[PDB]
Amino acid sequence: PTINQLVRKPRQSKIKKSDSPALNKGFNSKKKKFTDLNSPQKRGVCTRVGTMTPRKPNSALRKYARVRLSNNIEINAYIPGIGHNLQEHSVVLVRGGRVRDLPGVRYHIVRGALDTSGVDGRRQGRSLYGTKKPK
Amino acid sequence: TMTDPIADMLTRVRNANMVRHEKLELPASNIKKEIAEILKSEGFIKNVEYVEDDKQGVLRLFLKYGQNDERVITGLKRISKPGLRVYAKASEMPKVLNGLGIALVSTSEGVITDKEARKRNVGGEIIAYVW
RNA sequence: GCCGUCGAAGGUGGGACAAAUGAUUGGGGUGAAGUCGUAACAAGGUAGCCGUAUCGGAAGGUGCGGCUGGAUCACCUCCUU
RNA sequence: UUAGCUAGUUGGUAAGGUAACGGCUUACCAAGGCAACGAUGCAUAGCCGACCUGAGAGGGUGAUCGGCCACACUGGAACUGAGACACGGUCCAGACUCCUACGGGAGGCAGCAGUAGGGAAUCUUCCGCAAUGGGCGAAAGCCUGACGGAGCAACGCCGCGUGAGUGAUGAAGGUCUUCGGAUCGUAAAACUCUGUUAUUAGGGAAGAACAUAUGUGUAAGUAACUGUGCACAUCUUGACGGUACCUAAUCAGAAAGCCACGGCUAACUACGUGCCAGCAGCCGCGGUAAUACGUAGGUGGCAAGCGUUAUCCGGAAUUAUUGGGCGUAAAGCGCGCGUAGGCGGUUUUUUAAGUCUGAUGUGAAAGCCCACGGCUCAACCGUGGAGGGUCAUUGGAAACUGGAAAACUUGAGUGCAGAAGAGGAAAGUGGAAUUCCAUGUGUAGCGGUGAAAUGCGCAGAGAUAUGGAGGAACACCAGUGGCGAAGGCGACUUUCUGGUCUGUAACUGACGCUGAUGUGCGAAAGCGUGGGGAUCAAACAGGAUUAGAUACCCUGGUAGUCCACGCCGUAAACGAUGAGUGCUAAGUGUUAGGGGGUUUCCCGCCCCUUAGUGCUGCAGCUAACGCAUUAAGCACUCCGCCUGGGGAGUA
């Protein structure tokens, strides 16, 4: 627009939003507010492990899990890899990243850091899914 | 009400390029005569001829065209326009098209082409590029 | 040492604001090949759309004013070799 | 979607008080002050040199390092002292913890560690003042969790070797094979040198170390180098650390993996599997022959690191000043009057604020960049340079912007002659059509559908003929035709009232344009108040079609459509095109004018000029369609607006 019309307003932007809406963690304890603590990953206790299916055109029994996090929030995250060593009351570390199966789940746990043990059924992607180098 | 006479003259010049007519008519001004003279001195204007009638102007100029009827410049515009006036130092003065084009600039001592303005180490308010 | 002013903390009172909560409740996004009807997309089988009003389970309808972003036909008048 | 805030506030007087000026505090007088150029509030946040990114403008951050500020369990206060209202000082109040003879008393790790708890996650409860720097002392010397140094983490950067050469037989073996062979592959084995690094023995125990006091000798002062105050000599000081590093000897022996291989993007084969398991950053793979799942081989990238995740920038021109758009894609509000603001016709003189230009001071240092030097090189460090201000002072210039003064008319406005127009308000008038009623004539029908049915009709319909009453809009005229800023304006006559153009050019001499906020007008529908209702017509009734139709269909039918005054204040309010100004090929018309020639007379004809009002079209422009003097072209100023869809005009 005209230069003076641009002087008397700060040329506002289209500020983005987050992709991990629980990248944030509220105040742990001794407080009621929710801190803006940022993290690349959060631990959490899993209160149920379940399994659901994606929408069309994919068809598969995809395995997910709802987890209570340190910030006392409720999220969902699907377990990757072959075999899952989790159940209700199991603590687990969680990463961030969305899947296109169905919404309501946009994370996925990390295999081998927490109770969730790595599966040694793999030999190619070993540095993921917790597999250790075999000999 | 006309906001800017330089805009008028440059629009007249470009609109004379798009149809190619040797003669054009435009109310003159002292800055207009000076910049027309510098245009002739670069080589873009075949001839200059001021006239007088009630009251100002009206500056009549004779355009220039190549043997194959080719327009000399490939574009022409101003930089200093109202609202956002602009200025230029001696070292910071821009080399548009280097030698190819020139940069009309008004200085404390008068309006000159881009060159002399950087030679004398005196800048000023630019008016219009041409190339 | 006594008295006087200031004085925090504390108590009392009334308001303001924020967040959780709450029986129920309203609307929305989504999911099975759910059912009902098919208004809109063509002259969509009653042209559509815009606002308002009103009716109706509902898509919607109707009335009033407007637009073409309407077609079979056809512009008063006008343009075109 | 934070609009009023402030009463010691603002100003004064007087005094007190403070190192100081000051409503800093008191008493008196006054009512001002702050705020659209964003006060106040709310929410968040220490700031900066810089760091990261980017070509650049910019964007994000405030970790080390240095500067400034604020704080020391929470709140209040003050003594000392130059300096504190005090981090390891005091008193009180408050919370916590703890001892006690129960009477009362002791502390504040956001200091170093170290410990708990929280978190995804962040470390010794180290040696020592050898150096630098602190506090004190006359000094020696003291003290100093500053700091020097050591140590832990691949946390980061950089570098580093995991051997070299010769070596084919294409060895074996693995993989694939169209069963020939090919792949790994000089790769391996082996031969010869090597030791990166390591292991041993030695040295060096290297530098950083300079010194203070101590004796010789010298200058200033005193009567007195008697003694004192000043420079040399020689004596004397290492936690790091027996380091670093170096000498000689020995071995390829201790030292390599991770991701990816469909495209993006460099790198394919077999098998398993068969919409299952799974992959997935996107496009998307897989339901029996998956180069995309898993595995094997091979290959590519990278490396003592590699991949994932989160965050930031770029890409992203996807906030567009450099560097965006608004016909149709999101984006011109409905329009009008206009404040503040932004912008500004022509010429002269003048000022020199902006601008340009030179100097001066300053922009700490470290950092970025450049150049060089030193740690074996690099990393790093040092040196020096440049660079860095929207910086202040001051010397000059005056084209341009700006200030002042003086001239002009071409913009705008006025003036004199004209032109037209459904332009607005109030009233009345004329006739038809319609409706109702009445009468005469007159019969079996009238009415309606595609077919009907409903309804009306023997109380004589309809209709015909006449006359009368009602309410409601005005037949041709009517046209792409005009007026009006849009929404609008078509009956006539008058009264009052607003606008537009042409010519004129005498006249005022820039008085202009855009224009947030504010104000008013604003379709129809809807509403308040009272009438009128002839028609027409939401809701509604009947019938008909229809599987069903409360819809379309037919017959009625209320509100409503009408008037008068208020109310509301949207619309596909459009030309999906903001207003103002200037320029750029044409032809063809239309509405209200003007100049000229042709005619005895132009009224008959033509040319030229206006302004709107259209079309076809060139240049150019556009996603294309289309725009084209009535630009969506060529530019300028100003305003409005958009930054994916749904959510949603929703809360």
UniProtKB/Swiss-Prot annotation, chain A:
Keyword tRNA-binding: yes
Origin superkingdom: Bacteria
Keywords associated with the record: Methylation, Ribonucleoprotein, Ribosomal protein, RNA-binding, rRNA-binding, tRNA-binding
Any Pfam family the entry gives: Ribosom_S12_S23
UniProt-listed CDD domains: Ribosomal_S12
Subunit and partners: Part of the 30S ribosomal subunit. Contacts proteins S8 and S17. May interact with IF1 in the 30S initiation complex.
Protein name (Swiss-Prot/TrEMBL): Small ribosomal subunit protein uS12
Higher taxonomy: Bacteria, Bacillati, Bacillota, Bacilli, Bacillales
Gene from which the chain derives: rpsL
Swiss-Prot record, chain B:
Matching HAMAP family: Ribosomal_uS8_B (MF_01302_B)
Entry keyword set: Ribonucleoprotein, Ribosomal protein, RNA-binding, rRNA-binding
The family this protein is said to belong to: Belongs to the universal ribosomal protein uS8 family.
GO biological process: translation
Record gene name: rpsH
Organism per entry: Staphylococcus aureus (strain NCTC 8325 / PS 47)
PROSITE patterns, alphabetized: RIBOSOMAL_S8
Role description: One of the primary rRNA binding proteins, it binds directly to 16S rRNA central domain where it helps coordinate assembly of the platform of the 30S subunit.
GO cellular component terms given for this protein: cytosolic small ribosomal subunit
NCBIfam families for this protein: PRK00136.1 (NF001109)
GO molecular function, one term: rRNA binding
PANTHER family on file: 40S RIBOSOMAL PROTEIN S15A
Protein name as annotated: Small ribosomal subunit protein uS8
Subunit field text: Part of the 30S ribosomal subunit. Contacts proteins S5 and S12.
Keyword Transmembrane helix among record annotations: no
Domain of life (superkingdom): Bacteria
InterPro entries: Ribosomal_uS8, Ribosomal_uS8_CS, Ribosomal_uS8_sf
